[model samples]
Target: TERDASNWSTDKLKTLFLAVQVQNEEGKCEVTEVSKLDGEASINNRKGKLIFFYEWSVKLNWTGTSKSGVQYKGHVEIPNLSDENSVDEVEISVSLAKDEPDTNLVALMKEEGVKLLREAMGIYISTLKTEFTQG
Candidate 1:
């Protein structure tokens, strides 16, 4: 599964997640193209005034039987900025393809993917925010 951010709104901190659909065949996975709706991010302002809202539209592409298959998707948001002096939250929305399964395997994969994306984005945004704050 290949995850990528196609576009991002600097003002709103919203991002569009584009997941390129891939098929695992003959012991190799190949992405044919993106075949799902774009994901979005919105801030969770209710948590705190300074808290950011986030939403993600996940696009999942699956191949092969339930036992042997792979799911690929993308996530977009401002990331978690909660720290000692900073607090941030993001709401994400995910959209999956019909071809994708709704079984435990898929759910597990999605959960892990979401966690990874959040951490990754948080690290990146935190660094940038830190730099800005310092300057």
Candidate 2:
């Protein structure tokens, strides 16, 4: 979501605008937004306390256009990596296709794929840091 305040192409701006506008239409997307692990750990502590690993389940399904002006639909998801005990991997599954998609979709992320991935990591990972610490 980072952009140069001093520079921006109009089309890119339009794409970003459409995306945020769609957000407004998704009905409380920013405001609107689940689970517990209860099991003995495979590796326990010296005092016999169960130790556990961590894992994340993230599914971010999105659609947009390519910088070439081709419409596309894309999805990103976190694959299930383990059997509930030896897991904690944030594996992302992603794919993007073009032909036609929602007219309202944006191409901003499509253009900024790698940076967006890092940005997503920054936001979600930092939140997880605070989340894990409090727990």
Candidate 3:
């Protein structure tokens, strides 16, 4: 019999997790693409059925604009996503995609931008649970 885990391919998962978008009074961010998705998975037999488990990390590039009319970009590296992982495990690092000395903009990106990103990630986790099933 084919392993059930094999059915949940990375490409398939990627389609399911299309993109993430966040908008707030301060600014808006959009995760445009999944730059990378790599991991390992296996099948487990239980209750006369085959289930799957995986540990994957996803990399995405994002672009956003501040209400002040400034545009910035950055890369998001989601360290781990697994059957047991939580949203807290999702880490985000933001920058100008260049170099910036503007203190307020930098702080806004760090605080507000990061907060929106986390909210987007939380939505992602909820979708994963609803879409990916063992049965």
Candidate 4:
């Protein structure tokens, strides 16, 4: 649970997170994306105010391509930052041919992208409350 703040935080955040879940037709997906963003919360109360800052870096590359296989790998990090100018998110996705070249791989990329946004947003709001009166 979150403790009350000195006042309404009126805060901003430069948040980041990336969730990657890659599954095959067999219903098996990689869960490393969640591993990266499912980390510590950085919400803080600073001298009667609230300042929330968050950022993330996700790295994925074309690992391989084969007749019946494809691969991708890299890492994810909810980078460090200050509290300011926070808002907006995006979903940049690309689709393969009608063929299932690397559905799981791309799916992992997109899934992680949304997860990054969803996870941090969920944590950001749940960690703030007003304890005292004053800005």
Q: Model 3: per-residue lDDT, tens digit, 7-121?
A: 3344443443334454662455555665545665444544444343445566666666666666666665655455333333345444553542333554655555445444444
Best by lDDT: 3
Task: For residue 85, give model 3's deviation from the true position in Å.
Answer: 1.9
Evaluate model 1: give its TM-score: 0.36
Displacement of residue 73 (Cα, Å) in model 1 is 6.8
> In model 2, which residue pairs have backbone atoms overlapping below 3 Å?
54-88
Question: Under the 3 Å rule for N, CA and C atoms, how many clashes does model 1 have?
Answer: 19
Measured by TM-score, how close is model 3 to the native structure? 0.53
- TM-score for all models, in order of appearance: 0.36, 0.36, 0.53, 0.36
Candidate 4 C-alpha error for residue 105, in Å: 4.5
- For model 3 the local lDDT of residue 46 reads 44
After superposing candidate 2 on the true structure, give the runs of residues whose Cα lies further than 4 Å from its correct spot: 1-53, 81-90, 98-111, 131-135
> How many clashes in each candidate?
19, 1, 0, 8
Leading candidate by TM-score: 3
After best superposition, candidate 3 residue 17: deviation in angstroms? 5.4
How far in Å is the alpha carbon of 61 misplaced in model 4? 11
